[PDB]
Design a protein around this ligand. Structure first.
Ligand SMILES: Cc1cc2nc3c(=O)[nH]c(=O)nc-3n(C[C@H](O)[C@H](O)[C@H](O)COP(=O)(O)OP(=O)(O)OC[C@H]3O[C@@H](n4cnc5c(N)ncnc54)[C@H](O)[C@@H]3O)c2cc1C
Ligand SMILES: Cc1cc2nc3c(=O)[nH]c(=O)nc-3n(C[C@H](O)[C@H](O)[C@H](O)COP(=O)(O)OP(=O)(O)OC[C@H]3O[C@@H](n4cnc5c(N)ncnc54)[C@H](O)[C@@H]3O)c2cc1C
Lengths: 453, 453
């Protein structure tokens, strides 16, 4: 319901694709990974260049259209699609340049992680990021970004060296340690609040074959496995990463059919370092219970990335400073109640290099909390929403006093209120000052939102 | 030194990046995967859109510049870089659209395979392609394209539904079964001979987790393993793929320290189908020798793709109709002479769905030859070029009388003359007829070249 001259100026400056509610590919272009989010934008603007983004930002600003920005569409809160506004869709901006000599990568703001890992691994290089290949680099890096390499090399933001960004006034800025360093501070963990990142520059590291193990323990041996896990990681070397996924056992041939469809602890571990030393380290942590369905391999890092691991999702997540035996029994009891074969209760351990960055150095909070738990409900039948949502919420409720803060990138669509708790008073206020400078009208609000001033 | 108005018209129509010999990133941008190829283009034109390619093709045509086209830069013949001409570099055109409803993907002509597989596997979908994720989709598809999925679902070209292509006169055409079907026939196996493909459209298939095994046999049981392999694949189901790589044993922890550095047979297999059936089938073929370093897993297809497996390369390859005992001892004798730790002698079995497509249906030749052998020499030291090339060429000549044809995508920089034998006379001449229509002046000649008329 738009101004004809503003539209004509927009389309005149726009070399991407416009998708209207009447167009065929409207219904698919508006779907995101969280299929509980069903929203109808006025327009989807599939940008293909930084000038495209400039045009779309300016057009939304002048039209007063609610702006959703979409990288890979993995927002657990559904932030990358809007009712009645414009989607500034970056999914066609997925170009990457990798320099081996520089050991640097430049990636457009709509890249998927798997394309970035593919390009860097052509030269045996990598930078830390999440564990699922089709996650967008856009939202993930801007919230921090952690995965297999983080204990060794830090968060994705700890390897980011500069961004190209389009601000709410239509300008293009570079942000780095030497240019607009307040903005470069804020985008390292402050989400999409401050503008559209059209390019990320990363330092890369040499990562060769990785020793990897995945196995399944019966919940019978739950208390010993989890306590071994929490105790080992308190003093584990940086090179070891080890994560627990409590879930129904998949009906896979390495597992006895007995265990199929029943709650188990799936344990995944890797050693970022010499595979022969990795074999030693993994063996010392594989035997806290009897491992079933054991898979061991020496993998290219791109294949570790591709290994992990569902239409409707709901998550509740937070950090812990410690995992007591009492919290451990809580996790095991709620895991025993898992109904869907797609649902997981994730237990992750960060720390290491993530924890050695001074807390004030970026906008990412809670570096000093090493534990992360993610109650990730996933299902197919829309008529069962209440039961699955209830499982994640009741599990979070049972763990509440052990949990603090929160990872903005695991928030769900009802968790707008958690933004203050997530960053903490000092950070939130410091960010609120960056927002008043760079987004004073809060044009970019579909995110873990930081209102200006 | 070029016409200033032609240059200026070119630049006026070009929104991509131009890299000149004086620019910093020139020396890296002109490098390709085969590091024995050292060439200095007059200009590198990094195209970002189909109109960019139109501009570059016409500019090369009016200027009379020798045209190299670059997708992922994996040309074993070094065709993606030239001395004195223009490189039409597509590497920034890697946008992909996947429709889950349609089971279709559209990919730009500069895509790397890993980016494509990431995008399709977000929906548990795939289409057949090569086994190394940083191969370009461009050269691979135009030559045929085969890999883990091919025995079940055919070649990449057997799932291609259309292309957008820029021809030598600057026009943009669609080629499909219903539009320009002579061109659609030629691009399915005829290489870059007929124009620059700016977008590929593919049918996709649902590919869930695949049971996979890799193991190593001593060359001592070589005859037994290879004869079991050739005998088993003659009657194997489509769902089974099984490939042998003769090579020095990598210094990996799953293998006994003895074998490290010694010629071995690395055997890799997967079952495209039910993993429990896969487990049964793989166990039935893993014990033709004593398997060392056995790795078995149930993998997402994207992780299979990422699993496989150097600065200077030289390959000699061909097809066989049968693998006799005489040829098998030949393969084992030359494999024993492997000195490089990056060199592989590959034994592949195609057949299956690839062989069920009528021979005249595409320009891909030799569908009815199921075996492929590839002597893939790889090394680092430019001073050793002669010994490694000699190992690959001597191995080929010893196997030559069992060999017919050749896959254009495995041809080395000295194999320009192998083009007629590869396609065969009947196909080659029909291809020359399509070339006379669409590229009459042979503008596109850095490829396994088919001269017009
Ligand atoms: C299956 C799954 C696995 C995951 N695994 C991990 C993991 O291992 N580690 C981890 O740290 N996280 C993980 N995540 C979380 C992921 O980091 C976040 O969901 C992130 O927001 C995804 O970004 P996106 O571009 O894909 O999402 P979107 O839906 O496109 O965007 C997310 C948010 O970022 C904004 N945004 C996106 N791109 C840009 C851009 N270029 N410029 C400005 N704003 C932008 C959007 O406006 C929105 O606020 C996972 C998520 C899923 C669904
Ligand atoms: C490590 C490795 C593994 C491989 N594995 C496999 C495998 O498993 N299966 C398989 O079938 N092949 C495989 N190949 C071979 C591969 O198919 C060919 O090398 C292919 O030519 C590479 O394509 P590219 O775009 O990466 O190469 P480039 O060097 O960029 O180009 C190769 C040729 O294609 C032309 N070309 C490329 N893109 C286009 C386009 N869009 N339009 C027009 N012409 C174009 C170029 O002009 C040139 O003649 C492998 C190669 C390597 C090096």
């Amino acid at each position: 319901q738009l101004d004809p001259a503003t539209l004509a100026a927009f389309s005149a400056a726009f070399r991407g694709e416009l998708i209207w509610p009447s167009d065929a590919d409207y219904d698919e272009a508006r779907r995101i990974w969280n299929g509980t989010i069903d929203r109808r934008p006025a327009l989807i603007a599939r940008c293909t260049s930084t000038p495209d983004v400039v045009a779309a930002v300016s057009f939304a600003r002048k039209s007063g259209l609610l702006v959703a920005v979409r990288g890979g569409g993995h927002s657990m809160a559904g932030h990358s699609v809007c009712d009645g506004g414009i989607v500034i869709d970056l999914s066609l901006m997925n170009s990457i340049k990798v320099s081996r000599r520089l050991r640097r990568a430049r990636a457009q703001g709509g890249c998927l992680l798997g394309a970035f890992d593919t390009a860097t691994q052509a030269h045996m290089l990598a930078t830390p990021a999440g564990v699922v290949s089709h996650t967008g680099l856009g939202g993930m890096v801007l919230g921090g970004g952690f995965g297999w390499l983080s204990r060794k090399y830090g968060l994705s933001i700890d390897n980011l060296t500069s961004v190209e960004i389009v601000t709410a006034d239509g300008g293009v800025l570079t942000a780095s340690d030497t240019e607009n360093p307040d903005l470069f501070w804020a985008v390292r963990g402050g989400g999409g609040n401050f503008g559209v990142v059209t390019a990320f520059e990363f330092d890369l590291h040499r990562v060769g074959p990785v020793r990897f193990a995945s196995t399944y323990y019966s919940l019978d041996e739950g208390p010993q496995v989890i306590r071994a896990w929490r105790d080992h990681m308190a003093t584990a070397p940086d090179e070891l990463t080890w994560a627990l996924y409590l879930r129904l056992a998949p009906p896979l041939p390495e597992l006895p059919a007995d265990m199929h469809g029943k709650p188990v602890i799936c344990a995944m571990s890797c050693w970022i370092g010499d595979p022969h030393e990795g074999e030693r380290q993994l063996e010392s942590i594989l035997h806290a219970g009897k491992p079933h369905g054991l898979t061991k391999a020496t993998l290219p890092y791109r294949a570790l990335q591709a290994y992990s691991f569902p239409d409707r999702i709901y998550t509740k997540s937070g950090y812990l400073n410690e995992l007591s035996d009492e919290a451990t029994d809580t996790v095991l009891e709620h895991a025993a109640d898992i109904a869907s074969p797609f649902t997981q209760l994730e237990l992750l351990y960060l720390g290491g290099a993530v924890a050695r960055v001074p807390d004030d150095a970026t906008a990412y909070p809670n570096r000093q909390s090493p534990f992360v738990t993610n109650l990730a409900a996933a299902w197919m039948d829309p008529t069962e929403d209440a039961r699955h949502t209830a499982w994640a919420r009741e599990g979070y409720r049972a763990l509440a006093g052990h949990l603090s803060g929160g990872y903005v990138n695991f928030m769900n669509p009802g968790e707008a209120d958690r933004t203050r708790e997530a960053y903490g008073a000092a950070k939130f206020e410091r960010l609120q000052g960056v927002k008043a400078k760079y987004d004073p009208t809060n044009l970019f609000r579909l995110n873990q939102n930081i209102p200006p001033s």
